[PDB]
């Protein structure tokens, strides 16, 4: 006899944003009261008819909510307490930084560290994958050499864990607010899609990434570089899918990856490394 | 004689009504033997037939690991399908998955299966060669291209020709006295007037296992397939099944009608008639 409470679109919400609480009970988005003490309601027992729309979101909206749905033909007139939903209101100051160790390219099945860190001494850090409904994971901030930091473990890596993450610092005066979000960090999984071939292919020598698999896009990366180049895959007459990456090119060790359009966080296994000379 | 193992996954989005839910059940023939429900208090692969309980902790660990992984995968596939079909994040949608193997009486693989559906309609299916896909629409053609690149068919074939058959053989021995012993139907014919000029003859088959059965009415020897009402075979609740077939007959012509039953547990086909 427990309603289902939910926040939409996200329980992690910025000041000035919008969030809606609904309390689904007896196969309806019923009338409900909200609680934050589950034996005494908030707002002087205000009975929300269909949905509590908090808009614009303020810090006063942060908190840990439960609802009870209206049950007129019942001994107590109401339901048991619902699942709790924590509205976490994110802030506008003191943004931490987020970085992946060893890096943001994560082999399928392996783990990666998402390190949240700051010069600000945060008591706790939080990690939130953009667009998921779970509570942000929390870790104690560890102090060492004028930085506070926490190591979030993500894995074993698969496509549902890839994509954009944010981290946040705690707020001293409430457990339900967060710092401003870190800049985003995109995690990309490599595999299990088959690795392409990478090779030097009136002719001009190029680095060609190729496969019989119908990748939409190829990504070329150099060890010890930072900028990944990308090119659309071209259908060749041999039934192969290939991209030809062009005195300005750095020598060194290169790898390439295939990917599919609109799935930008899932790459193939890497090609074998290719040494490029001169 | 022949046997099958099947797993059935249902992944449901229910925005505002619950968390995305993943449920899975496993069958040997018509006998359900395991379940997983992401909504359960303690989500884990759990026994639903007594003979699966002879598997040890390592088995249940690995089955639970598989189910949690698939739940994570299919929750995200629901989100991907929304964008393929330009559907609203407010609606409720369902992915269903089936796979398994069929073996003949000698235990040799006869065919493998792996099929997928979105909102109750075919999406993509592994072909009988266990090496190629049939995609039902342009969205599933994207999925097909990804699964070709990831060599998914090779992994399905490896399972269907190996561990699927090996485990099915194992279960058949562990539950032999219920899985490999046919329970023949108990049969009788009932009569009920519909007026002073017509009546219903109803042929019953009760307590049989497995569920496959043929139940027909003949009149003077010819089958009344056009005038026969057949109910869907239904579970008794005790791992057996029930079915009936009825024909509407003119007053006084009951002796012309015979009910016919064939079932694995019946060494010869059966003929029944009604007598007051």
């Amino acid at each position: 006899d427990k309603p289902f409470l939910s926040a939409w679109p996200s329980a992690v919400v910025p000041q000035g944003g919008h969030v809606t609480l609904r309390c689904h009970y007896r196969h309806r988005f019923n009338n409900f009261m909200l609680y934050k003490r589950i034996h005494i309601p908030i707002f002087h027992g205000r009975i929300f008819q269909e949905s509590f729309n908090m808009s614009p979101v303020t810090t006063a909206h942060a908190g840990n909510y439960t609802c009870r749905g209206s049950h007129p033909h019942s001994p107590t007139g109401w339901s048991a307490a619902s699942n709790p939903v924590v509205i976490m209101v994110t802030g506008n100051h003191r943004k931490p930084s987020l970085l992946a160790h060893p890096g943001p390219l994560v082999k399928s099945g392996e783990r990666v560290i998402l390190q949240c860190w700051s010069d600000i001494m945060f008591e706790h850090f939080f990690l939130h994958k953009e667009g998921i409904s779970k509570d942000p994971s929390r870790l104690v901030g560890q102090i060492h050499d004028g930085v506070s930091k926490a190591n979030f473990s993500i894995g074993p890596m698969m496509f549902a864990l890839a994509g954009t993450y944010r981290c946040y610092g705690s707020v001293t005066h409430t457990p339900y607010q967060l710092s401003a979000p870190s800049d985003p960090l995109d995690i990309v999984v490599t595999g299990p899609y088959e690795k392409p071939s990478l090779s030097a292919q009136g002719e001009s020598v190029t680095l060609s990434c190729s496969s019989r698999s119908s990748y939409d896009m190829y990504h070329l990366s150099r060890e010890g570089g930072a900028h990944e180049r990308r090119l659309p895959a071209v259908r060749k007459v041999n039934r192969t899918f290939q991209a030809d990456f062009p005195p300005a090119t750095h020598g060194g060790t290169y790898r390439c990856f295939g990917s599919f359009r609109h799935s930008p966080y899932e790459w193939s296994d890497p090609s074998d490394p290719l040494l490029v000379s001169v | 004689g022949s046997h099958s193992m099947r797993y059935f996954y249902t992944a449901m989005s229910r925005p505002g009504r619950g968390e995305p839910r993943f449920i899975a059940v496993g069958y040997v023939d018509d006998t359900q033997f395991v379940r997983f429900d992401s909504d359960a208090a303690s989500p884990r692969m759990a026994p639903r037939a007594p003979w699966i309980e002879q598997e040890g902790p390592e088995y249940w660990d690995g089955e639970t690991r598989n189910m949690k992984a698939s739940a994570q995968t299919y929750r995200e596939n629901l989100r991907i399908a929304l964008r393929y079909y330009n559907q609203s994040e407010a609606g409720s949608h369902i992915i269903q998955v089936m796979y398994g193997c069929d073996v003949g009486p000698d235990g040799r693989l006869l065919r493998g299966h792996n099929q997928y559906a979105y909102d109750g309609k075919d999406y993509i299916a592994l072909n009988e060669d266990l090496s190629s896909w049939t995609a039902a629409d342009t969205a599933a053609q994207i999925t097909q291209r990804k699964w070709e690149a990831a060599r998914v068919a090779e992994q399905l074939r490896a399972y269907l020709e190996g561990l699927c058959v090996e485990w099915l053989r194992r279960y058949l021995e562990n539950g032999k006295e219920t899985l490999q012993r046919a329970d023949p139907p108990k049969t009788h014919v009932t009569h009920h007037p519909i007026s002073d000029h017509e009546a219903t003859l109803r042929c019953w088959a009760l307590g049989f296992y497995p569920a496959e059965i043929t139940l027909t009415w003949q009149r003077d020897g010819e089958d009344q397939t056009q005038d026969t009402e057949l109910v869907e075979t239904r579970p008794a609740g005790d791992r057996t099944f029930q079915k009936w077939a009825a024909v509407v007959v003119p007053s006084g012509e009951e002796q012309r009608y015979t009910c016919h039953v064939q079932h694995e547990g019946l060494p010869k086909p059966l003929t029944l008639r009604w007598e007051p």
């Binding site: 698969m158 496509f159 | 992984a69 399908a81 990804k146 699964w147 992994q155 399972y159």
Partner: peptide, 10 residues
């Protein structure tokens, strides 16, 4: 026993 599905997306 179930198949540990290839962790692939639709």
């Amino acid at each position: 026993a179930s198949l540990n599905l290839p962790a692939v997306s639709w």
